[PDB]
Design a protein around this ligand. Structure first.
Ligand code: MG
Ligand code: ZN
Lengths: 90, 83, 686, 49, 225, 331, 345, 234
């Protein structure tokens, strides 16, 4: 008669996979290499975030440009067309 | 054979279905495999065309794949081999 | 109900510490030895796996100081029945010889016929002469319990259905009206003043003042006393326990008088149910195999309608990471659902709630767990913070709705007695007005019972010639084979008690009414009557009363001498070709309502060591697909369904998420793997 | 019935189960060898005519 | 061939109950005619009844008012027996103030224009020196039994006690036929229908409304070509 | 109780008569409650035993089978339908072609022995039929299809794969609650229990061993009645057998000099299955088991086709005992 | 219907939650799965129209513990029912051993195509009519329904509108040209349902003897016409049974209906048996309402001779007691004698 | 008030004269309320005509068998009752049937005087043999319902005239059956299903229309007490 909080609740897994696919789709609809800089910054493929030094190292660029890219990409995703298919997940 | 027309889960009648196969177990597996085939035809429609075909008979507005499979069975549109 | 409170006490249980258990219980202990007569009722025992192990004391029983059960008896010396009542245990009942109360005493203590019904030592029944009788029963219905003594026409009922009636007379729920029965016994009044749930005027006096909350009585000598009521107090099983007064501001009361009715009391006496117009025909198959149909009339006028009060509780304890707080600062939920909550957590009184609503805003710390990358991205996209605290609020469980009567909040700050490591406790009382519906269990006083098959409208119900629709329709096929025709007799007398009779004793008294008591040759409409258990309405007296049943408003004797009436089909229109039995039957509402029983689960909590679903309806819970159902599915040849029900709905830990995903995405159900039961068995074997 | 003695003397005999009844196929969760589980019906090839 | 169309003669018995007699009819038809009219009258006659009450001192339905002998739910049960007839379809409201000892009758209710209370002699509650009962009632029109409308579905202001409404001015309907059925086959039925209303509208108006409902529903079947 | 009750429930019982009725009422209720558990245990054991009885082959091509009565003869030469034909013969595949006085083969090997078939067989004048059944089915692991006959639910030949064993176990276990007890022969559900459990009956009644007249050794308070051998060589001197129980009657009661059969029941009661096996073979012990179970089930008016009890009994008589090891591996 | 069953929508919504979630995601009523789940939990009224779609032709299983035998679990096609109680078809009460005292049943849900096919073909209600034990029907009408059919088909001599062959003054006045005319005469107060009349039937097969008499070999019924002296009730029973079945013309004792349904299941396909059983259910209930079977104490008549009977056996009981008292027999013998005396009484 | 949903009416035609009308969704529970009235009105309101009495020669007191015909008096009577004939006259017109010689007599063999038409073409009403003669004077009058054989309409004055039963109703069999239909989430509205079988005189659609006319007139006689009364407008 004891439940298991440490267990797959079987809606979290499918919801989480759907969130994954939808977030990948919305990231793909973004711009080219800048959505991927967001992907690296939040670590959507490598599993670790890495910092502006590493993003500049892999791309051959500076860090202020990276932060500007982050802010520019971040502004668009607050706009409803990207958010409407993503808001319900949070 | 003058039965009143069936409705719902009993269409087609199982007695006319049983003349196509040996036993009702064979009907069960028949319809299950065919319904699965129809389901993944519906799933694999977005991408390129593969070896799966169906539904050969025209379904309804919204129809479960198993009902389509059993109706195809009754219409003599499939063949099989047992184990 | 108050009767169940009275009958839980006065109960004899043969099981427990120092006594035999049910597995150690033989068959010979569960019978009725002939020494039970007057010391323990042979009717009322639980019907489940406890029959005979649990019974109750008789009405007149008294306990010997050495723990034995004495019983009163009227001593008769040399054939004059005296009044010296002497108490004997079973031994002196063996030694001496016992007569019967329903014997012809000739108004002098003297018997009439020498040849008399009598019990001997070993339970034998013979015909001793009217000279060796030394002891006599105090009254009939001495062998019977309290609850069973409240069944009219009990002597016509079979012992099985009498047992059922006694066991389900204690399961009625307190209705909002609680109308007293028409036909009853003498134990409707004394089973309520003794049960305790009826406020009794301790000492005589005049009423100073009344309200819905208290009664101030003025005693004859200076002193005044305030009796406080108990309004809408929750019982131990979720039912209401209202106590409203029945006295006025100028009335004079005596000591021992009922001054305020209780949960199931009406002007002093017990009322567990309502008087309903009953027909005994089989109607359209809706009253098939013990099913009962009702009128919508019982739904419209709240005839059968209980007020169920449920108690929810939540405590703000201490924890390793810190302390939780009952607050409005909850993590992600729209402010739409925070409208009902007051400024510091718990809901406002009177705010109606549905299933899954928030009752007590309570949030706990969580610590630091590294987020999934996509959670981090989605949080930063909307700018929302981590919100390190985790919400475990008191959500009202599924399948429940109703108002909120009262909120009782403790605190450590007021220095209340709380257990160790608990900061703030709070209980919320949520009540709902459960009406009658299709599926609730209804029952009379003679073991009849049934789920309600259908609530018809008032127009499609067989109505009498005067347009009065019947209220419920029982079935006929359940009457003769269960040998409980008391419900028929209680029906007939019920009609006689409703229309009122008048025996026109113009030329003497009619033959049947010769031994009727006075002021029974005529009665008023809706006049209450009572038949004691083993001396009640004789069948000839029922025929005589039913013969003269003076008309309602016009010249119209709706129910003829046979006890039947010409019903009109309210649905089709044609009159029914044969007359149908109609009457007024007293019927309760049992505590087996649908809302307590309906249950469903698609996915929910899971067990601890084995990974099976939980059960019991307290959680979501699932039904046990046991061994016998496994055999039944094997016999069909059903292989894949059995594989499903034993692998991917119970134990395939990696497979259940796969089946949910495959259903949501519209794919095919994945093939089952090995269950988490066989693997636990394998590891235990290793 | 009598799980202890059956288990211990089976362990002594090293008795290998063959998994061919309707109960040992239910315990381990694979398809039972009756009804729609036998190879005559479990291995039907279904193609459109 | 019998060719005389039936009549609808009337007979007043009391102020609220009356009999109607329809003759002559085709044989084997009076029972079905009476049942049709009964099932219409007893179910689908539009009326008016109280739906929600708001007492000042109560937050919900399961509490008590200080001073009144009665409690809130029995006040609900007593007001559920009220009879009231409106004229307009907006959810009108009426008030009721009472201070001091005495019985609170339905005549103490002050209604606005249009609505009226047809039985001032109804016992609602009884008070004392400390008693003070203020309540507002919401009357609307409708038909049949509607259950209590949940407060959340409504404006959801805490205190609006919702009450089951029964919009049925009819109270009891019966009938009986007197089929002559002579051996010469000039047979005809004779429907003696009976209507008793609960003093909201006269039985004539209830029967007229039932007849118009039936006319409107059978014009559906009549109008084909 | 020798009083007895003399009032109907319409007239209303008196106090003592009602108190007397309560005895039987409560006794019946508790007895029913225990009978549920008894039936459940019987069902579980029969399910375990009959689990591996599943139809595997369409036909085993055997020719051995049982003989069924099928409307025995009357002194007037009239065939009277045997009182239990809808349960014993009906829906069982005939194995030997029934020939009526060299008339014709009314039904051939391969028919289902249905209702119109039985009417034709009765019209033809034949009574004893040889039918294929699950005791004689010559498969290896699981009965064939033509030996089981007709699946009772479907109405056709049982499909290859159906688990007839669990159907049999459930069909013998469900009417274990309708079946009641009584009054030293056991005559209720415990009788069926001691039958399927293959225990020596508490009212054991030893049977004959050889034919011949009887050497009536009646003793005091017990009967040690010997049986003179017809051709045998020794008379079976029996021992103390309580004279309280009576003697089995046939033809008259067991009387001195009466000719007994090879396995005639001497005294009155129930025989054990072990002795009747050891004396008269598996065929006779199978007939005894089926007849004795169906006698109990017929007494309560419960219709059970014999093929279910037949599957159970076939599961009973599988193995053999080793009296001589030969020289190979058998203890 | 026989294959159908009730299912409370407040419970079907929880059984079919993933199916309805997917479907109302597909119909663009929700942006994603999470909004769909919240919409399901708040039960927005459009969740019911989609619930009807996801339920149609998707069987559920109805277990009742204790599952004594194979028919304790059966597959029904679910339908939505107002209320919270599962509506069970009355004809499976014998199989489930389920009266209506408050007995509960568990609904299970098959998921895969294999499991749905097994529920739909193997474990459907209309495919399991007969017992697995003896082949007798368990979908046979019982109880109330048998009373209805009995009252429907019983024959009352001296009833209203009989056939009599009296002539000279007036003709026979018992003949009816068609069952429609008989039904008209029954709606008027002329013909009682249980009167012996002569009807001209053109849509029912006559019994074997009459068919061999009037037509001999190949009398096909949908066109041919034939006379029958029967009750209107037996006709009204016989158009329920299929066309190919001959006329019955009997009084429907329970065993008669058992034999009829046994023959019907042995010779005809299963769907015909299911539909005939459903028709019998409808007629049985409808005419059990009209049978006027009630229980009153004026209905329960006592035997008038009972007192003389009790005296005649009390004298023998008194004789036995006196013989025990004087001492010719012991206690057990007098007990046995009294027992036999009262069994005779 | 508003009906809140408009009921429809659609028919399935099964044979030439056989229909299955469906009305959905009727406001609950109006299914029975209008269905029983419709069923009784169809069978017992629509006017029609049939043979009410017949006189045959050669049958005066022993109404057993008619000379020259294969059948008997009862068979001729039941064959004549099933005959459908229209009418335009309140008075009991007299059809004359007269055929001599062998062979069968058709339903069209009877001469129709002007007006009254024999809708059934050739239904076998007698089988004259041995060169027989048959002469029935039929009496046809219009009516409604099913008036049973009028017993002694006169004092048995025309002894040859045998009073037969009279199926006046053009429709022969109406069976009503309500069901359950979902509206929004109510799942309780009443769907009425009528199975109507008529003879070939009129179409079932026209019979339903005429019965609706008669019922709406009767309930308008009910209505015309206070015309300005509120209730349920569709
Ligand atoms: Mg039960
Ligand atoms: Zn075989």
């Amino acid at each position: 008669f004891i439940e298991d909080s440490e267990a797959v609740v079987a809606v979290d897994a499918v919801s989480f996979t759907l969130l994954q696919d939808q977030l990948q789709s919305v990231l793909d609809t973004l711009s080219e290499r800048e959505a991927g800089v967001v992907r690296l910054r939040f670590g959507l493929t490598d599993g670790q975030p890495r910092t502006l030094d590493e993003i500049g190292q892999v791309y051959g660029v500076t860090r202020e440009r990276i932060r500007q890219i982050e802010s520019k990409t971040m502004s668009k995703l607050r706009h409803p067309s990207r958010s409407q298919v993503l808001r319900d997940y949070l | 054979g003058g039965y009143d027309t069936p409705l719902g889960i009993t269409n087609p009648p199982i007695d006319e279905l049983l003349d196509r196969v040996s036993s009702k177990y064979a009907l069960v597996i028949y319809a299950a495999k065919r319904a699965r085939q129809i389901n993944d035809y519906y799933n694999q429609l977005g991408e390129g065309i593969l070896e799966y075909v169906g539904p050969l008979v025209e379904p309804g507005l919204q129809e479960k794949p198993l009902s389509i499979a059993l109706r195809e069975i009754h219409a003599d549109l499939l063949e099989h081999t047992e184990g | 109900n108050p009767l169940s409170g009275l009958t839980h006490k006065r109960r004899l249980s043969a099981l427990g510490p120092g006594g035999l258990s049910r597995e150690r219980a033989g068959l010979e202990v569960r019978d009725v030895h002939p020494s039970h007569y007057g010391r323990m009722c042979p009717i009322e025992t639980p019907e489940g796996p406890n029959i005979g192990l649990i019974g109750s004391l008789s009405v007149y029983a008294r306990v010997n100081p050495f723990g034995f059960i004495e019983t009163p008896y009227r001593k008769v010396v040399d054939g004059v029945v005296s009044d010296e009542i002497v108490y004997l245990t079973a031994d002196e009942e063996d030694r001496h010889v016992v007569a019967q109360a329903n014997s012809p005493i000739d108004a002098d203590g003297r018997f009439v016929e020498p040849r008399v019904l009598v019990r001997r030592k070993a339970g034998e029944v013979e015909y001793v002469p009217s000279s060796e009788v030394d002891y006599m029963d105090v009254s009939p219905r001495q062998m019977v319990s309290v609850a069973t003594a409240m069944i009219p026409f009990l002597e016509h009922d079979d012992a099985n259905r009498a047992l059922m009636g006694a066991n389900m007379q204690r399961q009625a729920v307190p209705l909002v009206r609680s109308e007293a029965p028409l036909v009853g016994t003498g134990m409707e009044l004394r089973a309520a003043i003794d049960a305790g749930d009826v406020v009794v005027a301790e000492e005589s006096g005049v009423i100073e003042e009344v309200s819905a909350d208290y009664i101030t009585v003025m005693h004859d000598n200076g002193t005044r006393r305030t009796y406080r009521m108990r309004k809408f107090a929750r019982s131990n099983h979720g039912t209401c326990a209202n106590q409203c007064p029945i006295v006025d501001a100028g009335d004079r009361v005596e000591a021992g008088q009922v001054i305020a009715d209780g949960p199931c009391t009406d002007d002093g006496e017990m009322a567990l149910g309502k008087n309903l117009l009953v027909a005994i025909m089989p109607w359209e198959g809706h009253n098939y195999e013990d099913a009962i149909i009702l009128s919508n009339r019982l739904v419209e006028e709240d005839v059968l309608t209980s007020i169920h009060i449920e108690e929810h509780e939540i405590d703000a304890r201490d924890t390793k990471l810190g302390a939780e707080e009952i607050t409005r600062d909850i993590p992600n939920i729209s402010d739409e659902v925070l409208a009902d909550l007051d400024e510091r957590g718990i809901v406002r009184i009177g705010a109606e709630v549905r299933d899954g609503d928030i009752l007590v805003g309570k949030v706990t710390p969580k610590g630091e767990t590294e987020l999934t990358p996509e959670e981090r991205l989605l949080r930063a996209i909307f700018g929302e913070k981590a919100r390190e605290v985790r919400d475990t609020s008191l959500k009202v469980p599924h399948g429940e709705s109703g108002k909120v009567i009262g909120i009782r909040v403790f605190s450590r700050e007021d220095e209340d007695e709380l257990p160790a490591g608990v900061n703030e406790l709070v209980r919320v009382y949520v009540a709902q007005k459960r009406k009658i519906s299709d599926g609730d269990k209804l029952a009379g006083r003679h073991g009849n019972k049934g789920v309600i098959g259908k609530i018809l409208p008032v127009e499609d119900m067989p109505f009498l010639a005067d347009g009065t629709p019947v209220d419920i329709i029982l079935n006929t096929h359940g009457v003769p084979r269960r040998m409980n025709i008391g419900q028929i007799l209680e029906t007939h007398l019920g009609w006689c008690a409703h229309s009122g009779w008048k025996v026109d004793a113009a030329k003497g008294v009619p033959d049947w009414a010769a031994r009727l008591p006075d002021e029974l040759l005529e009665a008023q409409p809706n006049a209450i009557v009572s038949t004691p258990v083993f001396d009640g309405a004789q069948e000839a007296e029922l025929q005589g009363l039913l013969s003269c049943t003076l008309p309602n408003r016009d010249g119209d004797v709706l129910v003829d001498a046979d006890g039947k009436a010409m019903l009109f089909d309210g649905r089709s229109g044609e009159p029914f070709p044969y007359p149908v039995t109609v009457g007024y039957m007293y019927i309760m509402k049992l505590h087996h309502l649908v809302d307590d029983k309906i249950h469903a689960r698609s996915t929910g909590p899971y067990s601890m060591i084995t990974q099976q679903p939980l059960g019991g309806k307290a959680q979501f819970g699932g039904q046990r697909f046991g061994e016998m159902e496994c055999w039944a599915m094997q016999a069909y040849g059903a292989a894949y369904t059995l594989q499903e029900l034993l692998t991917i709905k119970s134990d395939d830990t990696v497979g259940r998420v796969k089946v949910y995903e495959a259903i949501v995405k519209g794919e095919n159900i994945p093939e089952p793997g090995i269950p988490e039961s066989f693997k636990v068995l394998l590891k235990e074997l290793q | 019935q009598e799980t202890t003695r059956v288990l211990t003397d089976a362990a002594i005999n090293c008795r290998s189960d063959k998994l061919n009844g309707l109960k040992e196929n239910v315990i381990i969760g694979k398809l039972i060898p009756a009804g729609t589980g036998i190879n005559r019906y479990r291995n039907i090839a279904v193609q459109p005519t | 061939l019998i060719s005389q169309r039936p009549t609808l003669s009337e007979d007043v018995l009391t102020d609220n109950r009356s009999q109607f007699v329809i003759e002559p009819l085709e044989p084997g038809f009076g029972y079905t005619l009476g049942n049709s009219l009964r099932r219409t009258l007893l179910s689908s006659i539009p009326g008016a009844a109280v739906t929600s009450i708001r007492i000042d001192g109560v937050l919900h339905e399961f509490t008590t008012v200080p001073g009144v002998k009665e409690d809130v739910t029995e006040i609900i049960l007593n007001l559920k027996s009220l009879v009231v007839s409106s004229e307009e379809d907006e959810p009108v409201t009426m008030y009721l103030r009472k201070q001091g000892p005495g019985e609170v009758t339905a005549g103490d209710i002050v209604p606005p224009a249009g609505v009226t209370v047809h039985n001032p002699g109804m016992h609602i509650a009884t008070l004392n020196d400390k008693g003070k009962l203020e309540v507002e009632l919401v009357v609307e029109r409708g038909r049949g039994y509607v259950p209590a409308v949940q407060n959340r579905a409504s404006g959801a202001e805490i205190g609006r006690i919702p009450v089951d409404s029964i919009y049925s001015p009819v109270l009891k309907v019966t009938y009986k036929v007197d089929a002559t059925r002579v051996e010469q086959r000039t047979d005809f039925d004779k429907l003696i229908l009976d209507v008793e209303t609960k003093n909201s509208i006269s039985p004539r108006d209830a029967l007229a409304s039932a007849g118009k409902t039936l006319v409107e529903l059978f014009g559906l079947a009549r109008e084909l070509n | 109780i020798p009083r007895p009750v003399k009032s109907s429930f319409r007239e209303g019982l008196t106090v003592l008569e009602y108190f007397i009725n309560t005895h039987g009422a409560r006794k019946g209720l508790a007895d029913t409650a225990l009978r549920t558990a008894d039936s459940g245990y019987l069902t579980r054991r029969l399910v375990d035993v009959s689990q591996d009885v599943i139809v595997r082959e369409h036909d085993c091509q055997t020719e051995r089978g049982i003989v069924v009565e099928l409307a025995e003869r009357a002194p007037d030469g009239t065939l009277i339908r045997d009182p239990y034909i809808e349960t014993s013969a009906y829906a069982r595949t005939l194995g030997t072609d029934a020939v009526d006085e060299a008339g014709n083969v009314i039904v051939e090997r391969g028919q289902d022995l249905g209702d119109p078939e039985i009417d034709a067989l009765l019209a033809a004048g034949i009574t004893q039929v040889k039918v294929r059944s699950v005791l004689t089915c010559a498969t290896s692991t699981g009965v064939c299809a033509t030996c089981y006959g007709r699946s009772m639910a479907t109405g056709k030949l049982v499909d290859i794969g159906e688990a007839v064993g669990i159907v049999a176990a459930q069909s013998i276990g469900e009417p274990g609650t309708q079946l009641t007890m009584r009054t030293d022969i056991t005559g209720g559900l415990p009788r069926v229990q001691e039958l399927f459990e293959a225990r020596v009956p508490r009212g054991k009644a030893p049977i004959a061993d050889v034919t011949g007249r009887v050497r009536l050794e009646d003793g005091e308070r017990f009967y040690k009645i010997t049986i003179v051998p017809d051709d045998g060589g020794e008379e079976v001197v029996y021992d103390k057998i309580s004279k309280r129980q009576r003697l089995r009657v046939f033809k008259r009661v067991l009387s001195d000099g009466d000719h007994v059969e090879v396995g005639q029941q001497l005294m009155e009661g129930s025989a054990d299955p072990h002795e009747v096996l050891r004396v008269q073979g598996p065929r006779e012990v199978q007939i005894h088991l089926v007849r004795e179970v169906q006698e109990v089930y017929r007494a309560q008016g419960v219709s059970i086709h014999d093929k279910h009890i037949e599957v159970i009994v076939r599961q009973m008589l599988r193995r053999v005992t080793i009296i001589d090891s030969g020289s190979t591996e058998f203890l | 219907k026989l294959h159908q069953c009730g299912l409370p929508k407040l419970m079907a919504l929880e059984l079919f939650k993933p199916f309805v979630m997917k479907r109302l995601v597909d119909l663009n009523h929700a942006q994603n799965i999470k909004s769909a789940k919240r919409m399901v939990e708040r039960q927005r009224p459009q969740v019911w129209d989609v619930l009807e779609e996801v339920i149609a032709e998707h069987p559920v299983l109805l277990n009742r513990a204790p599952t004594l035998h194979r028919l304790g679990i059966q597959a029904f096609e679910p339908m939505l029912v107002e209320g919270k109680a599962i509506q069970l078809h009355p004809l499976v009460c014998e199989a489930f051993n389920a009266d209506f005292d408050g007995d509960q049943m568990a609904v299970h849900l098959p998921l895969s195509a294999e499991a749905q096919a097994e529920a739909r073909i193997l474990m459907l209600s209309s495919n399991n009519i007969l017992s697995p034990a003896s082949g007798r029907p368990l979908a046979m009408p019982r109880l109330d329904m048998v009373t209805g059919l009995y009252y429907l088909t019983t024959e009352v001599p001296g009833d209203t509108g009989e056939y009599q062959p009296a002539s000279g003054d007036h003709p026979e006045t018992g003949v009816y040209s068609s069952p429609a005319e008989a039904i008209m005469a029954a709606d008027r107060g002329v013909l009682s349902v249980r009167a012996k009349i002569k009807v001209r039937l053109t849509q029912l097969r006559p019994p074997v003897e009459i068919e061999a008499e009037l037509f001999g070999h190949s009398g096909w019924q949908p066109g041919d016409a034939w006379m029958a002296e029967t009750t209107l009730g037996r006709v009204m029973f016989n158009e329920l049974l299929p066309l190919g079945y001959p006329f019955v013309n009997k009084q429907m004792h329970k065993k008669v209906q058992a034999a009829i349904i046994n023959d019907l299941a042995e010779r005809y396909p299963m769907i015909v048996v299911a539909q005939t059983v459903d028709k019998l259910k409808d007629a049985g209930f409808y005419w059990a309402t009209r049978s006027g079977v009630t229980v009153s104490m004026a209905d329960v008549l006592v035997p008038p001779r009972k007192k003389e009977i009790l005296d005649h056996y009390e004298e023998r009981a008194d004789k036995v007691e006196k013989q025990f008292q004087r001492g010719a027999l012991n206690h057990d013998e007098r007990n046995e004698a009294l027992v036999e005396i009262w069994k005779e009484a």
